[model samples]
Target: QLTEDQEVVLKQIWTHLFHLWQVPVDGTHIKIHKALANLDPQTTKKQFWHDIKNETPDATILKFIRARKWNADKTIAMLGHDLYWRKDTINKIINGGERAVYENNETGVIKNLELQKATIQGYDNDMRPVILVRPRLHHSSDQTEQELEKFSLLVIEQSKLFFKENYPASTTILFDLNGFSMSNMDYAPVKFLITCFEAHYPESLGHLLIHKAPWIFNPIWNIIKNWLDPVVASKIVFTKNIDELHKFIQPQYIPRYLGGENDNDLDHYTPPDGSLDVHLKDTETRAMIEKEREELVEQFLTVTAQWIEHQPLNDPAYIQLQEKRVQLSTALCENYSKLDPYIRSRSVYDYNGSLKV
Candidate 1:
């Protein structure tokens, strides 16, 4: 279910940005749509934009950019409230709204016009351009902020205690960033790569934090590739070879014991540090190991598609977003095909929490 506007917004963004970037807006489409249908349509575009201020609203920006990427003049013309009007009348709305100001970082302050036009007019990379943006803010109270801050500190302390107790001999801890939102530059390919890491390093490299910001991609990928040594790298698995084995390791049960909602909870727990791979050498075996990487990724995709299909949508707009998922998964598979080792081995585990030979 989608209200007229939510439907429009979902469709507009999904269609335009699915290929450009994977928004994951459709991940919960089933529930989202149902909720949208049941609720009174209360959120205006301004309000929605505000709610997602720090997160990736690139889906919306891509919608606008797609309309004008080839024509800067037309993109510039898309600035006022009237731009939101129906094509027939193009009447300026009486919403009592304002074209939100996008703070010009280097030049002090400027309006969205100055920012958007600067980019569109190829004044991009200029120090004086105003960045166009929807003005929105997170609606957390000061108390909540204090609580989360305290909680984060507690977590850090706990981690330190655990590390000190368990790894006194280690000098450096290589943390594999769990789903850190490599910022809004993300699309399907990046996510697919993330999923690859998740499938293989379900315990070790999972549990790092990331958000949908447009800046964290390179760091996350780099950490995953470098931190896990060659032996652990060799242990990385794809779904194709271990379908039955992986399905047996009930994630739900693991999560219960590990203090999380599921065993593969990459957001909260990761493999302990210094679990180095002693087998990392550029010998014949290493060459053979590399050759199997791409195939492993492809096998991972087979599972990814299945997972996406089984995912319940939150709303009609979410169902519509499936097209975007398809786009991401497809790109990921293609990318894997072109990488050096064309496939990977299966990291097999049994359903009863045992390793399968």
Candidate 2:
């Protein structure tokens, strides 16, 4: 257990693990990458130094990339810290905007505004942004409503903090949103749903729940109808309004539980039942694609105002030549490591940049 080399490697692995020290896994992802870099074979001094480089990104990058089910593991990590992703050298995102709720054709104003005020006030004290998304219901010919089920909503909320993220799943923080889909649904009422939900969560928060389709469908209409009941809408829970609903939910002891479960080998572990690890990975991939698309659009805009207007239309080979010139310029612009001043001049100067006198 105490071989000097092995100890050194373990230390390095610990450093790498720090990069993901604050992740919140919500059953969406798991860490199943064999942390091979920390093994004796890969624990040479040279490799240890290499792990510190941004290019190689150390063991954490490999851990994530080589993970068997990356999405599931990663999602769990993200949920615990914050329900948002960030880039190392990219822009920082602040998730403080009002929740963008889409129901009953109302954008911002709703009858739930007062309830929302109470919930947000409670949340301001100890709240985190969270999304309680539910599947849309199939519509009927005579059904004139949009709604989300109560059990579905509660289950989604509890499941995330419990079986997924390994966090405390609290049942005491009972929040009631206005039922816009109850038999006598009203658009103005469910506005208070936001407040009740926020009452028990922390502020400066961010949470997201994704869906496969555009915001359409009707079974959703029914739940909204009940939650938006004007007569009972104000009855929903909030900070000051929390009575028996403010009971303490059990906080699972994660360190002990996750200890035996945190296998870093992708080939060994199997994902849990009914977890969103698969979907979470797809979502991350979609985000990466969107970012790449945006970058490509910016690159295209950097070129001529009209690609057709500036390009010659007649000569076939001439078009080829123009394309080649562009390609050649890009090739030249490419960041070749050998062309780097540090690499090229490695033999010429010392770390101090002094001449070899």
Candidate 3:
């Protein structure tokens, strides 16, 4: 399925992966990285590899190598630039916290809720993870461009970590423009988001399928899409109807609200409250945290109820309750204390902020 030059490129990718990452170099990774690197490379390095860093996914390294068309000097320079960029920009979000996604806990912002208009629903036919973006869910009154940017990175990072096991291949972003209009399009944040995906998370986007995009949306799309490289831009598909989605995605994988077989609502995609318990495979620890959280929330409610009923904060009962909450808080902190340093350490990689290459 690959040409002679392509086969050589594949070999180079596998060799580098084995050399640097020390991970198994499989045909799947080779093909994906090869295609990404072969995409349009005339785009400026500063644009594509801004704020470079040394640490990155094997997939990213191969992407730069192939983009350089196996020219060692050029590829090395671009990869160096990218490593620095990743450290300066993307690492913050990745190391933020497990629930850092809930940083924007403002009204209208999606949080630990079950249902939402915008979420990563499920997998596509090709087994690529699917992200469903419903523009109508956006509440301009409740959020700012920066907050949305944080949330976007949160979701992207979660996708990388969460899907690492079963669907570590690529991601297919499905935009449901059912209610898309001029008001729904926020230019600055949208622009920054595109930059985040292209500059930092190269080759992660397998496809972008826009569904039910209104005729009025074309001008805005054209303007924003200009920021993307020609090859990336070519992956975008403007679907004329719901049926068109079946061309790239199967009906069974799509949500019913979007006209598919899924009987559940979009919220079905949302993880359960305190779903972190699912990750805490140690059954004993998982149960302990769940019980701890449940009790903490309960104590908080009880204390608040007493104060609302005219109880003074200085009252013996209220003071005692307050102490209990503090104790529970500390206990929970101790419960997951190990995670704190590990998260903070990811942001402490050695880098002088200058692209030495």
Candidate 4:
């Protein structure tokens, strides 16, 4: 629910950021979509629309709007940069143009292990996905920092696929600080997570649960807080034990070590799961689904153009397209699932059924 003022701002943000909007964007952003001059069938845009899960374009737009505290100017610019960032990071990895994946060797497992041990198993009562990060298992010096950064992006990318029947999807990361130590303190990934959520992933972080924080984290917290975007800084929550965490996360979802039923850690596997091989090896089927996905994109955009023409006034026709858009949204999402196997390896979430309902 948005304030009337915020509601009014949504259309304005929509107009500015829509891929087909008249404005090519000003300032630091490139003349977005200038690719009109050099288009090719095989080419993919570096700046493209990355859909939000379980939400309309407006809902996703509101995320950026609220993250910028409803200051429309910053929201517009932030989204512009985010489009390119998503492409440069996630899309490139998905396209096999870069390395966001773990290789199939001994060292590859070592790289994936850093984040693999962390679980994406459950959700809180609010329906926000719970990402438990046990920092004690990670040592920054043990792996390549660049690989860690890409994997972090990959983690953010993969989490969106499990968005349940909830709107305004966000995640709660439980950073278990129970072990108490300086070795686990890696400021680089910490900074990356902050920037990823606050800027690129906007409003995607519902809470940062700092469980069993030793007094030592106080000094570190003070400095780290300074780096957080002010709005994001508000999401930091502290907990001494399971009792404290229960207010946000359910007992079933909490790990056994934290006094809960879950004992599903360390069931980690970094193998590509070859689930990706399903569609890839089956070329005709892969191409078949890709065509459907492409057609879905076309249908979605074409209707969006039509909806814009009839919007806010054409109530009857508006409802017609309004209903039409959701079906396309569903197919588009479902289509992504069929096409999902075409790219990337299987995650532990897929293997252990952590995200399964």
Candidate 5:
């Protein structure tokens, strides 16, 4: 179900997209009608967007519109360009052994790659996937711009797959610049990252942590900031140290190197091969995963409800309610910090959970 504002945005974007592509958005089966018209065989090599929408019929086009801040023309143009790019580059790569292309030549798996330098660290308090990127380890002289792009795209695709089955929302990227130098900065990869998040992977960015950046980073960041869309720029956070990062990301989720509880073992950094691949082909596997997720949600709700029932209402925290301030009952407030991730995991995609008390 969509909010009034989201419905309004969808209508606005749909109207504009129909105007631009001469697609029908008013029919009883609007998605089908729109797909047929916009994806006319004579206009393009393939109907990439049409196929994607068909595969995930429940996926909302409104996300793309929301990503572009309801600018209908901008969203339509971006989606059109993205469809062609996906058909030419992303689809071809994924279809033709994306894992082999991304894997280490010897290991045939990501677990053997130099993944210690970068990995999906863990989930934040909200269960959003947190990725750690070690910029210094990726020397430009060692890896070409193309190699970096491939590695980035592979990791990103894998991360998205991981999140979809678990968190099913946006992700947090932490760029650890501890050893970063001027020579490590590359415009191509940075621009590519911006483009991927903005145009291709709409509404996927939860937050960006620029952690432990050297003094030289300011100049580079100023240049990079100009390339970022306003919505993305707003997500950028500058953290002076791991202590600062810990305020947002919990201690259990943080890496040991960064003064968190997790082991810093490089061997543990490698994920199984094919774990990153999109898994829509296996209906049985997907059903099993969904069943597991449902069981977990039920267990979480049961435990949370039991905890809430046992809370002491006579306590000061429960008794004192303030005026003209946002508040929750003490039990709900206490449990919100604890059970929010489980709640959000089963909640609607648009339930961002940022406004919880």
Candidate 6:
């Protein structure tokens, strides 16, 4: 389904990754001989850094490869360093406890109003999810850009959990430049966003849709565009109106404020803090499923080792193993929803059914 280099390069990365984890790498003996050795899910938990209980491995690996222009060595090194970054992030973003104010309490409702500035709703024509960023609602005096820096990490991971396979990487960002003024133009978040997508998230942005940019933004855009990666710069599109926006998105998903038929109202689409408590504090229930995930991670890595080793040798069994790998990926990604509420915040996507319940 991919190029010879893409397919050949992917297997090499998988093989090296297995060895990096100090695991058995032969595709022929994934099931029987490795069984008697120290192959428990607990051991897999300690050795595994690739998925951390839930990720679609093939697509994730391909994204990393594409990020490095299909050079196996560069992709390996980048992925190697990413594991270190991802570990530190795991504690803060997932294990460090609940983030965002999703409670229905009087004060909590007021707290969530600020987060309403951003929304991830429908997919683009390419099936990449659309993130509506209403930066005009922000004020530097009210919150630090560091807060947005942390918040966007959550949004990035959420969309990754949503989309995998096909056009497996990237999300479209529709930056609404509607209510513009110099006060709303903060460079701190802009710099971080550019760096985040360029390095940390890599190839995760399909389009940077600039909607309704007034003339004042022209000079500012000059500065910001200089900060973009050439690849990302090409993705930057200047959409003039709803019709121009409709070229990328269907009219049904566009907001009436932008002269579209749909209201795109976040307030009206909001849900009660339905499972906020369960997600935030259901320690007992959450712990039970994590064990289930660790074991799946074990089998997944084992089969993957076999899959990669056999693939180059023209083993017919590799095709069957590929089928197995897809189902394993489906399990990890779908069951992750059970783990989601407990581990992360409830963004608008969760409530609006963009990411499914």
lDDT of 4 by residue, 138-244 (tens): 77666676767766666666666666654437777888887868987888877877777667888788788889889889999998999987766778888887788
Per-residue lDDT tens digits for candidate 1, residues 108-168, read 1122112211110000111111111111211122123333222222222222211221112
Structural similarity to truth (TM-score) of each candidate: 0.17, 0.20, 0.57, 0.81, 0.62, 0.81
TM-score for candidate 5, residues paired by index? 0.62
Q: What's the distance in Å from true for residue 252, model 5? A: 1.6
Deviation in angstroms for 7 in model 2?
14
Q: Residue 164, candidate 5: how far off, in angstroms?
A: 5.2
Off by over 4 Å in 4: 1-10, 17-56, 92-100, 104-109, 112-117, 267-276, 311-314
- Angstrom error of the Cα, residue 205, model 6: value is 0.6
Candidate 5 error regions (>4 Å): 3-5, 8-59, 91-99, 102-112, 164-168, 267-357
- Candidate 1 stretches greater than 4 Å from native: 1-7, 14-271, 276-357
Winner by lDDT: 6
Which 10 consecutive residues of model 5 have the lowest summed lDDT?
Answer: 345-354
Q: What is the C-alpha RMSD of each candidate to the true structure, in Å?
A: 24.5, 25.3, 20.7, 5.0, 13.3, 5.8
Name the best candidate (by TM-score).
4
Q: Per-residue lDDT for 35-125 in model 3, tens only?
A: 2343333232223222212212234455666556667555655554554445434555655433344553433334423235445556776
Preferred candidate (TM-score higher): 1 or 6: 6
lDDT of 2 by residue, 106-125 (tens): 32222122122111111111
Score residue 297 of candidate 1 by CA lDDT. Answer: 35
Q: Residue 348: error of model 3 in Å? A: 28
Please report the TM-score between candidate 3 and the true structure: 0.57
- The regions of model 6 sitting more than 4 angstroms off are 26-55, 88-115, 164-168, 266-285, 311-313
lDDT of each residue in 22-116, candidate 6, tens digit only: 66875332232221233343333353432443457777778788889998778877766555455555434533322333332323223324455
Taking the candidates one at a time, how many backbone clashes does each contain?
38, 56, 12, 0, 0, 3
For each candidate, what is the lDDT?
Answer: 0.28, 0.27, 0.53, 0.64, 0.54, 0.66
Model 4's alpha-carbon lDDT is 0.64
Tell me the lDDT of model 4 at 230: 70
